[PDB]
Amino acid sequence: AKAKTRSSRAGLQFPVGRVHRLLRKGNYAERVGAGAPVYLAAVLEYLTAEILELAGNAARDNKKTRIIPRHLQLAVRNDEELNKLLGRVTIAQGGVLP
Amino acid sequence: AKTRSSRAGLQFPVGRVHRLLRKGNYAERVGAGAPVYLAAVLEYLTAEILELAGNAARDNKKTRIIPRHLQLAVRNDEELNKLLGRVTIAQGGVLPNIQSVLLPK
Amino acid sequence: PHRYRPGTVALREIRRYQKSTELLIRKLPFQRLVREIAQDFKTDLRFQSSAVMALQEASEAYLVALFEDTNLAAIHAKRVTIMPKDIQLARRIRGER
Amino acid sequence: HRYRPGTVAREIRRYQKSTELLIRKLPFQRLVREIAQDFKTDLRFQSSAVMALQEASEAYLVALFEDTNLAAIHAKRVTIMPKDIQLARRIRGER
Amino acid sequence: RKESYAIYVYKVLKQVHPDTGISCKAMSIMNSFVNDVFERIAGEASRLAHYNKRSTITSREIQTAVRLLLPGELAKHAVSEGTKAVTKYTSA
Amino acid sequence: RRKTRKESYAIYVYKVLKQVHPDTGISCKAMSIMNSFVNDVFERIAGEASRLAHYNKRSTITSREIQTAVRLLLPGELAKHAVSEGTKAVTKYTSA
Amino acid sequence: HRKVLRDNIQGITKPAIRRLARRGGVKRISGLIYEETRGVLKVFLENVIRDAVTYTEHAKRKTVTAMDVVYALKRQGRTLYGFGG
Amino acid sequence: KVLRDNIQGITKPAIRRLARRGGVKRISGLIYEETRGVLKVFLENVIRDAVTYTEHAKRKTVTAMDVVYALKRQGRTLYGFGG
DNA sequence: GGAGAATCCCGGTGCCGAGGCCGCTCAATTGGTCGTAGACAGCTCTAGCAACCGCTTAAACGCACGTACGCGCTGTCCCCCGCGTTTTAACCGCCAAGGGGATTACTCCCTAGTCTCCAGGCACGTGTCAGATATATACATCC
DNA sequence: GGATGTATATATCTGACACGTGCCTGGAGACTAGGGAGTAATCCCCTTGGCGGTTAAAACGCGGGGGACAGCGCGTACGTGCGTTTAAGCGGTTGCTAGAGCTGTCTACGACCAATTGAGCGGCCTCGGCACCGGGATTCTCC
Structure with a gap:
């Protein structure tokens, strides 16, 4: 039959096969279930989109059409839950909140 | 059937450390001398903490080590207190320490 | 009659409670509090007694460590009485609130 | 013409709006090489490595100065003093 | 490669x-972010599997x-997203 | 059962x-504390060595x-005496 | 289904908070400290119990064990020795 | 060649700028030496681990990934250099 | 300085239950063998790191003057401590019931391993504008 | 009201961003075999709930003193501006060195099987440590 990717079956953009490979070759357990890479890829894609939307809103507020680390820093620190998740993380060339 | 701890001259079990390494999902393979090295380091740290704990026990006219003595031994040592800086010892208490600003004059 | 000066009893109690290791909160009230907090995450839960004891040990260690930093802040402000702003500053600099 | 002491500290708004590094690069690189001299002789560095070190250290110092200012305000002052840095570092868990 | x-x-x-x-530096920051969250979730799942034998x-x-790792509403929405994806993948 | x-x-x-x-x-609670200490140190060293092996492929x-x-994990003279103890143990094990 | 516990934070009485502050080396205490400490303790317990009940539910049990609490504390950087592990 | 007073290369105006980005108005004169000592301690703690990682790999050049791992292992994750 | 007094510590007394010693069993360790892939050594080679140099100019440095802030002293008053009395609920020791977690045995289905085949992502090469820097300016902040 | 830093608009314009090519490595499909996992049943232990006593702690109220807080004065140290000096940054150059990739070899590790001994559980005892008491000594507050 024709080869359909596993991420097109789940309706995702992130690579399910690469995530499965990185789970297998990362020494996490002896076996890896069939739906664990799909779940993980969906979660990673969701978090990526959540950050990127706020960063693009920040970029538009500053009359820019291109996201730079300053916009990522602003988007993260102005959001409560994202700031809690990335609390011990430093973003290079991000600055601080005025 | 000679044991590996006796070959290495140790008290801790080299076979059990090897098995825990092989079954802990740390790498595909485990070297032959890794369990020996790790068992030696574990026994060294055990002896280090137990010596101070026993000294603290003797300073209090006791002949058994209790968690209070372990707490005293760990917190009175500059490097053990840094190794165990985020560890809570149950029934250990604190170190007697009053700020000098609160003492009467 | 006889009355010790305000502060002698405080230092006496500081020595007394720094020399001991037992738990300073009553056990039945702490257990009721733990069950009440837990009934909001799942109903009809059961606890091992050792679980409640571990919770109490951790909570008391946390509170004593917080009071030490609170005292440091109160002294920094040139006071001997601790106030809620000292707790707030201690938790702010630690990274909790 | 002279601005009141305080008005030219404008500087807070200027340096909280930008993102560039506030320490110069050659002195920091010399300091890093001198510090690393005591762990192993004849070491080499990627430029990427020195820039990462500078980013990390500047972020650390800015985050420390924020807590130092909190302590100075707690003591009902506006000037930061070494005792403020010491209190901040001690409550964090570094002293 | x-x-x-x-x-x-x-x-x-x-x-x-x-x-x-998006610029190169922002793209590398996003790459570091996705790698970091992958490592966190995978390590926590490994520990969960070890705890239960x-x-x-x-x-x-x-x-x-x-x-366990995401706070508040992030966790709720991520759980819904993951469940929806696994449901779509299975019946297909 | 059993x-x-x-x-x-x-x-x-x-x-x-x-x-x-x-x-x-030694009492029972102190022995439990020592058991927890040994397990914690084992896990720390093993995880760090695992990351080290993964970094170098x-x-x-x-x-x-x-x-x-x-x-990387032990501070000060603890690290020196620990590496000396481990090296001596490995040497004696191999010489046999 | 048992009963619904309510108003149990007041069981953390004032003498007990005074004893905790004494072991903390504190000499004088304001009257507004007790409610602040009750709130702080409630937040701390909520976080730890949330994580412990998560572990208990994943294991598909109905009883919370001591190892659940140990894991919940450890994943927050507050390792505890003496209760297994 | 050996190096000398390079901690004095961290000038006073640079420390003032770092404090301005932190939101500080007035600065005592004794803050600069304190800040230099703190920075030196932090740098030593990070560079020790970075050189350890470099020596374990049998390399002579310290790379950016060594710094990234050294910062990560002490709870100071840094995005922007991991590739 | 003494002097009376709550308060703490040492010695001595029972007295117990938890620590220390021992036997039996079985599962985990050890020894031996074989296969094979990961690791190590040697060679090449090229990118990138160190070193030098010259010039520009912006940033650091040093000095003086003024003023705003930190610090010390004093007085007030309120609110925390100490103590005595009363009231309440924790704790300890029972008992009774049952549910749920651990164990055992069996089935079966899902995941690893193998191999084949193809397509998607990644370097390489190419064309274009988003954002930075300049020049001028009206404006908002400040004294 | 005048000074002065501040955001706004326009012109330049380039180096980084987005797009088009080959291919080869990694992902997908198909088949096979075995062990991990789920199900059902059994059982006992440990969790929940209740009662009763008893007594130690908590709660409450009153008096008082001492510590927090506000105000005032003063002097010092920090900021601000200006003129001078220095060294960082940039653009080049060169050299060479170490990290990276490739190839071949072989030793060390996994897998499997058999033998056996060390370690964990169940008993069996006995003394360090603790509650209680008495005496002496110690800090503590008033004269």
């Missing part, structure tokens, strides 16, 4: 903001690791 | 104690990984 997530990040960006670019990492371990 | 055998380090900690303090005993955890992990 240094594999990165740059193209998938770009595909997602084209969905949220159709007319917005299991050999397999399944979607249930991933769900519990997400509930 | 009580499952639980594993601990009680006998080895007791042997080390009888080596250091021949006339001192290796498949084997050797004694070099253990030594580097001990140097």
Whole structure:
């Protein structure tokens, strides 16, 4: 039959096969279930989109059409839950909140 | 059937450390001398903490080590207190320490 | 009659409670509090007694460590009485609130 | 013409709006090489490595100065003093 | 052959903001971010499987690791997204 | 049915104690604390050596990984005496 | 289904908070400290119990064990020795 | 060649700028030496681990990934150099 | 300085239950063998790191003057401590019931391993504008 | 009201961003075999709930003193501006060195099987440590 990717079956953009490979070759357990890479890829894609939307809103507020680390820093620190998740993380060339 | 701890001259079990390494999902393979090295380091740290704990026990006219003595031994040592800086010892208490600003004059 | 000066009893109690290791909160009230907090995450839960004891040990260690930093802040402000702003500053600099 | 002491500290708004590094690069690189001299002789560095070190250290110092200012305000002052840095570092868990 | 997530990040960006670019430094920051969260979730799921004497990492371990690691509403929405994806993948 | 055998380090900690303090005993709670300490140190060193092997694209955890992990985790003279103890043990094991 | 516990934070009485502050080396205490400490303790317990009940539910049990609490504390950087592990 | 007073290369105006980005108005004169000592301690703690990682790999050049791992292992994750 | 007094510590007394010693069993360790892939050594080679140099100019440095802030002293008053009395609920020791977690045995289905085949992502090469820097300016902040 | 830093608009314009090519490595499809996992049943232990006593702690109220807080004065140290000096940054150059990739070899590790001994559980005892008491000594507050 024709080869359909596993991420097109789940309706995702992130690579399910690469995530499965990185789970297998990362020494996490002896076996890896069939739906664990799909779940993980969906979660990673969701978090990526959540950050990127706020960063693009920040970029538009500053009359820019291109996201730079300053916009990522602003988007993260102005959001409560994202700031809690990335609390011990430093973003290079991000600055601080005025 | 000679044991590996006796070959290495140790008290801790080299076979059990090897098995825990092989079954802990740390790498595909485990070297032959890794369990020996790790068992030696574990026994060294055990002896280090137990010596101070026993000294603290003797300073209090006791002949058994209790968690209070372990707490005293760990917190009175500059490097053990840094190794165990985020560890809570149950029934250990604190170190007697009053700020000098609160003492009467 | 006889009355010790305000502060002698405080230092006496500081020595007394720094020399001991037992738990300073009553056990039945702490257990009721733990069950009440837990009934909001799942109903009809059961606890091992050792679980409640571990919770109490951790909570008391946390509170004593917080009071030490609170005292440091109160002294920094040139006071001997601790106030809620000292707790707030201690938790702010630690990274909790 | 002279601005009141305080008005030219404008500087807070200027340096909280930008993102560039506030320490110069050659002195920091010399300091890093001198510090690393005591762990192993004849070491080499990627430029990427020195820039990462500078980013990390500047972020650390800015985050420390924020807590130092909190302590100075707690003591009902506006000037930061070494005792403020010491209190901040001690409550964090570094002293 | 240094594999990165740059193209998938770009595909997602084209969905949220159709007319917005991104620079190399911001793209590398996003790559570091996705690698970091992958490592966190995978390590937590590994520990969860070890605690229960299991050999397999399944979607249930991933769900519990997400509930342990993400705060508040992020966790709820990520759980819904993951469940929806696994449901779509299975019946297909 | 039958009580499952639980594993601990009680006998080895007791042997080390009888080596250091021949006339001192130890209670049950203190032995549990020592067991937890040994397990925690084991897990820390093993995880750090695992990350070390993954960073260099290796498949084997050797004694070099253990030594580097001990140097990364232990502070001050603890690290020096630990690497000397480990090296001496490995040398004696190999010479046999 | 048992009963619904309510108003149990007041069981953390004032003498007990005074004893905790004494072991903390504190000499004088304001009257507004007790409610602040009750709130702080409630937040701390909520976080730890949330994580412990998560572990308990993943294991598909109905009883919370001591190892659940140990894991919940450890994943927050507050390792506890003496209760197994 | 050996190096000398390079901690004095961290000038006073640079420390003032770092404090301005932190939101500080007035600065005592004794803050500069304190800040230099703190920075030196932090740098030593990070560079020790970075050189350890470099020596374990049998390399002579310290790379950016060594710094990234050294910062990560002490709870100071840094995005922007991991590739 | 003494002097009366709550308060703490040492010695001595029972007295117990938890620590220390021992036998039996079985599962985990050890020894031996074989296969094979990971690791190590040697060679090449090219990118990138170190070193030098010359010039520009912006940033650091040093000095003086003024003023705003930190610090010390004093007085007030309120609110925390100490103590005595009363009231309440924790704790300890029972008992009774049952549910749920651990164990055992069996089935079966899902995941690893193998191999084949193809397509998607990644370097390489190419064309174009978003954002930075300049020049001028009205404006908002400040004294 | 005048000074002065501040955001706004326009012109330049380039180096980084987005797009088009080959291919080869990694992902997908198909088949096979075995062990991990789920189900059902059994059982006992440990969790929940209740009662009763008893007594130690908590709660409450009153008096008083001492510590927090506000105000005032003063002097010092920090900021601000200006002129001078220095060294960082940039653009080049060169050299060479170490990290990276490739190839071949072989030793060390996993896998499997058999033998056996060390370690964990169940008993069996006995003394360090603790509650209680008495005496002496110690800090503590008033004269």
